[PDB]
Each structure stands twice: as structure tokens, then as C-alpha cells.
Amino acid sequence: ERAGPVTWVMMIACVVVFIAMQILGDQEVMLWLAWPFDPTLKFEFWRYFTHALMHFSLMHILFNLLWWWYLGGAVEKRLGSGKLIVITLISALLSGYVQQKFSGPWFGGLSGVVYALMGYVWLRGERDPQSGIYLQRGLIIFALIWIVAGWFDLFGMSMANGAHIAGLAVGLAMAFVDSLNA
């Protein structure tokens, strides 16, 4: 009982990327991994996802990865690799899209995906506890605090509020759908 392959690879990739940003600077890394910021870039398709891999401070990566580890790891063990992969891909594109829409292509990090995972895990537990999946009371509280910090901009998280809701909404939709089975 550890962190599965999707859980573990993402963490590794985010770390390696953060190191690359510490050495080359953020800008050089953004140049390569950010949402297409020019028409000439619109068919470099990794860019619609690789923005989620870049973090700008230690707070930012530390907390995103704690949540990812705990929640993404829970989803992966109890529900499967494919599920985590899908939640991640969809929440990444959507939050990316909204961010980009309201504020330009210069952003990054896994917090959109974390809002999806928070909404997914909380609502699956609410609607379908027998899945094995739920957010603990204590943790609802820490989640909520983490959300507040970002909503009221008490700590720098790269992405804006409309993008985090997009992320949340995706996680809610998917839990909804998933719990619609039984």
C-alpha cells in the first residue's frame, strides 16, 4: 500500500520540472511548457496539458503535491489508474482554458486538478460512501482553508478563482456521474 504509477509519475514530473525551473528560470521553462501563447504554437499539443506541471514557489508545489498524493493516490488505489488519468486530463484542460481566457497563457500548476480531486472525493463520499472514497471531516476543514487562501489571494497559487471552480465543477460532475450507477 503506497502511491500507484499515475500518482507517482505526476509527482516525479512536477519535481523534475520545478528543478528545471530553478536552474533555467521559470521563463525558459514556460517558453516550452506553457499554454500556446502564440498562433505558431497552437499545434504543440502537449501545451494544453504541460502547464499543470510547472510550479512557481515551494509553498505552491508542496501543497499541491500533498493533496495530489493523498487524494489522487486514494482515487488510484480504490478506483483505478484510468479514473485518475481522466479526472486529471479533463480538469487540466478546462481550468487551463478558463485561466487562459480571463488572464493570458502565463500560468501553471496542479491546483485546478486538486480542486477537481477535492470535489470528486467529497461528493463521491457524500453520495456513495460504499465506494471506499470520502473526504474526512478534519480534512474537509483543511481543504476549505486551502481554498480560502487561494480565493482571497492569501497565498500565491498561479491560477485564478474562475479556473479553480472549472476544476471543481469537473470533479463534481464526474463524482455525480460515477455515483449515478448504483
Instruction: Clarify whether 57 is annotated catalytic.
Output: no
Question: What are the Cα distances from residue 173, in Å, to 55, 87, 141?
Answer: 27, 10, 22
Of 55, 82, 52, 54, nearest in space to 167 by CA: 52
CB atoms within 10 A of CB 114: 30
Instruction: Clarify whether 164 is annotated catalytic.
Output: yes
Distance CA 81, CA 78 (A): 9
Task: Give buried/exposed letters for 118-135 (b at 16+ CB in 10 A, else e).
Answer: bbbbbbbbeebeebebbb
Q: Among residues 91, 111, 131, 158, which one is catalytic?
A: 111
Of 170, 145, 167, nearest in space to 63 by CA: 145
Total domain count, the chain = 1
All residues at 6 or more sequence positions from 43 whose CB lies less than 8 Å from its CB, including other chains: none
Question: What are the Cα distances from residue 6, in Å, to 46, 87, 122?
Answer: 17, 12, 21
Cell of residue 163, nine digits: 479556473
- 3-state SS of 23-40 is HHCHHHHHHHHCCCCCHH
Q: Where are the alpha helices (DSSP H) in the chain?
A: 5-24, 26-33, 47-50, 58-67, 73-78, 81-103, 111-127, 137-151, 161-179
With beta carbons less than 8 A apart as the criterion, state whether 31 and 101 touch.
no
What CATH number is given to the structural domain containing 57? 1.20.1540.10
Residue with cell 517558453: 31
Q: Which domain holds residue 164?
A: 1-182
Residue 83: phi, psi to the nearest 5?
-60, -50
Distance CA 24, CA 96 (A): 23
Give the experimental resolution in Å. 2.4
Of 106, 104, 111, 113, nearest in space to 26 by CA: 106
